[model samples]
Target: ITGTSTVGVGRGVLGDQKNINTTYSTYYYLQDNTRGDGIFTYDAKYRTTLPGSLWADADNQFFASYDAPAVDAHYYAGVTYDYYKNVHNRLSYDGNNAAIRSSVHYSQGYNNAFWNGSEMVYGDGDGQTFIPLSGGIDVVAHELTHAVTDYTAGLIYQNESGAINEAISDIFGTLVEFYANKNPDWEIGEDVYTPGISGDSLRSMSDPAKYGDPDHYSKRYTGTQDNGGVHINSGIINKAAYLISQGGTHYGVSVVGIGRDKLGKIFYRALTQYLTPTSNFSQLRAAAVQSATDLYGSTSQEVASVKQAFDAVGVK
Candidate 1:
C-alpha cells in the first residue's frame, strides 16, 4: 500500500518507550522507509509462517502489551542499520543497502531468534526463559550480524568455522550494544535470557567458562551435537575478543588492551578480507594478526595484542 513515512511511539517488551519508524498506508504499518532500501517488520501472530502480515495499527501510539515485540523489532533493526553504516561504512547487511526485514512472535512460547539466511525471525519466549527476544537490542543485532557474516565470510556452519561464525555475531552484537550505550557488556543474550534471574546471561564473552563454555582451545567441544558446538565453542573466540579490547592475562598468557574501536576495525577487516568458508581456529588467529598488521602495521602493538589475545585463549 502506498503510504507516507511517519514516526510512531510505542512501548517495547521491557516497558521502554521508544520512537519507531513506520509507514502510514491506510494504517500505520511497521515499515520504515528511511534506511537503505527499506526496513520492514511483520508479525507472526504466534504461528510458524514466514514473515506474517505486515504489522498494522490504527493510531501511531503502540502501548498495547502485544505490540511491544513489533515495536522493538522495528526499532532494533534501525539501530543495527545505523551501527553498520556509521561504524563500518557498509550500506546494509549485504553492503549494498539491502532492505532489512524482520518477523516477530514466530511461534508459541518460542525462545530464540535467527536470520534464516535472508530475513530475521524472533520468538516471544515462554516467559520463564525470556520475554520477547526483540526486547534485547544485542539479540536483535546478533541475529542481524549472521546475515552480515553470510554475505561476507560465508563461513561454513560446522566445527571451528561455525564457532567462528557464531563468535562473529556475538562480538559485533556486543559492539552494537556498546555503540548504543545501553549498559553494554561482553555478554551475549543477557538482556533477554531468563529475565527472572538477574546478572546471568546465556553466554559470557569476558568469561565463557562462567557458563560451562570453553575459554581455551583445548577445552573446545568436538561432539557431533549443535553443529559441532557452534554456540558452545564460540566462547573461546569470544574470550579472545574480550581480551583484545580489555587486556588481560589468561592461563599465564597476557594481552595488552587495544580498546573496542580498534578491535572492531581489525576483526571487521579480517572477516571481510581474510576468512574462508572452511577457516578454523588456527586460521582465525592468522587472519586477525594479518588484519591488525594491515590496519596498524606489522610492528604495531595492535598486531602484538591480537597475537597475545589468541595465545591467551590457547589458540596458537
Candidate 2:
C-alpha cells in the first residue's frame, strides 16, 4: 500500500501499551518503513497459510484484545532488527537489510513460533501453555536469531551442531532482551509461557537444570528424538553462556564473569567468522575462545573466562 509512515498505538498480548510502526493509506497496516527493507506483520486468521494477509486496521489505533499479538509481532521484530543493527553493526539477519516478515495467529490454539527457514511464524498459543508467542521479546528474538544463524553459521539442524544453533539463538535472544531492558533475565520465554504461572519459563539459561534441562555435558540427551536432542542439549551451552556473562560455579568448576557485552561480542564474532555447519561442542569452545582472543587478546581474562565457562559445563 502506498502510504505515509506513521506510529500506531496498541495494547499487546501482555496488556502493555506499545507504539508500533504502521503505514497509513486509506487504512492502517502493520508495516514499518524505518528498519531494513521494512518490517511486515501478517494475520493468519487461525489457519496454516504462510504469511497470510497483511494486517489492516480501520484506524491507527489497535487497542482491541484481538489486535494484541499482531502488535507485538510487529513491534518485537523491529526491536530485534534494531538489536542486530545497532549493537552488532550488522544490517539485518543476512547483514544486508533483508526485509523482516512475521505472521501472527498462525493456527488455533497453537503454542509455538519459528523462523520457517524464510520468515517468522507465531502461534496464538493454547492459553494453557502460552498466550501469544510474540508477547515475549526473548522468544521473538530467539526465533529471529535462527535466521541469523542460518545466514551466517549455516549450522545444520541435527545432533550437536543443531544444539549449538539452538544455543546461539538463546544466547543472543537473552542479549537482545537485556538490550531492551524489559524485565530482562537470562531466562527464555519467561514472559509468555504459562500465563497463569509466574517465575517459570520455557527454558532457563542461568540454570537450565531448574526445568530438567542439562547444565552439564554428561547429562545431555543422546536419543534420536528432537533431532538428537537439539533443544534439550542446548541447555549445556546455554549454561556456559550464562557463566561467561554472569560468572557462576557448576559441578565443582568456577568461571569469572566477563559481563554480557563481551559475551555477545565473542559469540557474535564466533557465529559470523569461526563457526561452521558441522561444528560441535568442542568446536564451539574453540570458536568462542578464539573470538574472545580476537576481541580481548589471547591472554586476556575474557578469553580465560570463555575457557573456564566451557570447562565448567564439561564442554571440554
Candidate 3:
C-alpha cells in the first residue's frame, strides 16, 4: 500500500498500550515502512491459510480484544528487527534488509507460532494453555531466529543438528528478551505460556532439566520422536549456553560468567560464519569456541568459558 507512513495507538494481547507503525492509505494499515522494506502483520481470521489480510483499522487505533494479538505481533517484529540490526549488525533475517511479515489468530484455539520459510505465523491460544504467542517477546524472537537460521546455518531439522538449530533459537531468543529488558529471565515463553499459571515457562534455559530436558550430553535421547528430540535435546545446549552467560557449576565443572553481550556475539558469529546445515552439538561447541577465539583470542576468558561451558555439559 503506497501511502504516507504514520503511527497508531494500540493495546497488545497482554493489554499493554503501545504505538504501532501504520500507513494512511484510505485506512490505517499495519504496514510499517520504517524498517527495511516494511514490517507487515496480517490477520488469519481463525483459519489455517497464511499471510491473511493486511490488518486495517478505521480510526488508526486498535484496542479491540481481537486486535490485541496483531498489535503485539507487529510491534515485536519491529523490536526483533531492531535487535538484529542494532546488536548483531545484521540488516534482517537474510542480512539484506528483507521485509518482515507475520500473521496472527491463525486457527482457533491454536497454541504455537513459527517461521514458515517466508513469514511468521502466530496462533491465539485457547486462553488456558496460552493467550497470544506474540504477547511474549521471547517467543517472537525465537520464531524469527528460525528465519535467521534458515538463511544462514540452514541447520537441518533432525536429530542432533535439529537440536542445535532449536538451541540456537532459544539462546538468541533469551538474549533478545534481555535486550528488550522486560521482566527478562533465562527462560523461554514465560509471558505467554499457561496464562492461568504464574512463575512458569515453557522451558528453562538456566536449568533445562527443570522441564525434564537433559542438561548433559550423556542423557541425550536417541528415539525417533519429536524429530529425534529436537526440542527435547535442545536442553543440553540451552543449559550450556546459560552456563556460558551466567557462570554456573553444573554437575562438577564451573564456567565463568561472560555476560549476555559476549554470549550473543559468540553465537551470532558462529551462526553466521562457522556453523553448517549438519552441525551437531559437538560441532556447535567447536564453532562457539572458534568464534570466541576470533573475537577475544584463544587465551581470552571468553574462549575459556566457551570451552568450560561445553565441558560442563559433557560435550567433548
Candidate 4:
C-alpha cells in the first residue's frame, strides 16, 4: 500500500495524502490496537522525523508542499461534512461512515469542476478568464452533492438524468450558501478570480435571466453546452427551489416562502432519501413536494408552495 497510487496527478491539483493517512491509520488501529495508539496518537508526532516520512512517497509529494487549492479543498470538505451532518443529519456523503476525498487543481486552464465517483476534482481556472473552483462554499458543495448523488440515487449523467443531477447539486449548494448566512447579497466565487471578473459567478440563483437566460423553462433550452446543457437547464429546478424557499418569483410574482432551514431539509431529503437514478423532472417535482409534505405535512402551506413552485417551472 505504500507505493500504490490512490490518487491522480494534474496541474494545480493534488490529492489529500494527509487525510488518507489519518483515516487509514484510524481504521487500522481500530482493527488492531497493536498497530499504533490510534489516528490521533499516530498523527500527534507523525509530522516528526521518525515515522512521518514513512507515508511520504513520490505519489504523495503534493502534501509535502503547501498549495492554495489543496488548502481550500480541505476547508471545503470540512464545511460540506458539517452541512450534511448538522443540517441533513447524515454522517457523510453516504449515510454510512463513508470517507469523502477531494482533489484540487485538477488541470491547467480547466474551466469547470466536477465529481468523479471516488472523489471531487477541482480546477484552478484559466487565470485570465475564471478563478479557482474551490473559491466558494456553494461551488464546493455543488461538486460534493454530485458525489452524494452518486452514492444515493446514482443519477445518470444524461438527458433528464443529467439535468436532475445538476439541479440537485444547485439546490443543496444554494441551501448551504444561505445556511452560512454570509451576506444577503453574497454571490459565489467572488474571491477566487481576479478582482475584475470575480463578481461574475458560474450561475445565478436569484436572476438566471441576468445572463439573457429565460426566466422559465423553454423547449428550445435544449441546445446549449455543458453536458446536454444539464448545467444550463438546471436553472429551471434552481429557480423553482429558490422560488419555493424564498417565497418569491423568478419573474415578479408573489409566491410562498418556506422556512430556510426547512427548505434546505426538503431539498436534501428529496434528493437523497427519495429520488432514484432514473428520476426525471416530473419525478423530482413530486419528490420535492412529498419531501415538503413529509417534513412538514400534507396540509402545510410550505408543501403547497413547493408544489406550486415546481408547477410554475412546468415540472408538474
Report the candidate with higher TM-score, 3 versus 4: 3
Q: Which residue pairs collide, candidate 1?
A: none
In model 1, what is the error at residue 244, expressed in angstroms? 0.4
Query: Per-residue lDDT tens digits of candidate 3, residues 1-316?
Result: 8999999999998889999999998999999999998999999999999888999999999999999999999999999999999998999899999999999999999988999999999999988999889999999999999999999999999999999999999998888889888789998999999988899899999888888999899999999999999999999999988988899898989899999999999999999999999998888988999999999998999999999999999998
| lDDT tens digits, residue span 1-316, model 4 | 2121132222222233233222232122101111112111111121212211112223422333334455455455666677787877887777775655555545567776677676666666777656666656677888888888888888888767788898788777766776665342323444454536536765676666665444576642666466677766777777777788777754444678876677778877887788898888888888988898888899989888887787677776
Provide the overall lDDT of each model, using Cα atoms, as 2-decimal numbers: 0.93, 0.93, 0.93, 0.62
Each model's TM-score? 0.99, 0.99, 0.99, 0.76
Q: Tell me how far the alpha carbon of residue 157 in candidate 2 is from the true structure, in angstroms, after superposition.
A: 0.9
Lowest lDDT sum, 10 consecutive residues, model 3, at: 174-183
Candidate 2 yields a Cα-based lDDT of 0.93
Off by over 4 Å in 1: none
Which parts of model 3 are misplaced by more than 4 Å? none
Worst 10 residues of 1 by lDDT: 187-196
Could you give candidate 1's per-residue lDDT for residues 26-128 as a string of tens digits?
8999888999999999988999989899889999999999999999989999999999999999999999999999999899999889999879999999999
Residue-pair clashes per prediction, in order, are: 0, 0, 0, 5
Residue 231's lDDT within candidate 1 is: 96
Query: Would you give me the overall lDDT of model 4?
Result: 0.62
Distance (Å) between predicted and true CA of 119, model 2? 0.5
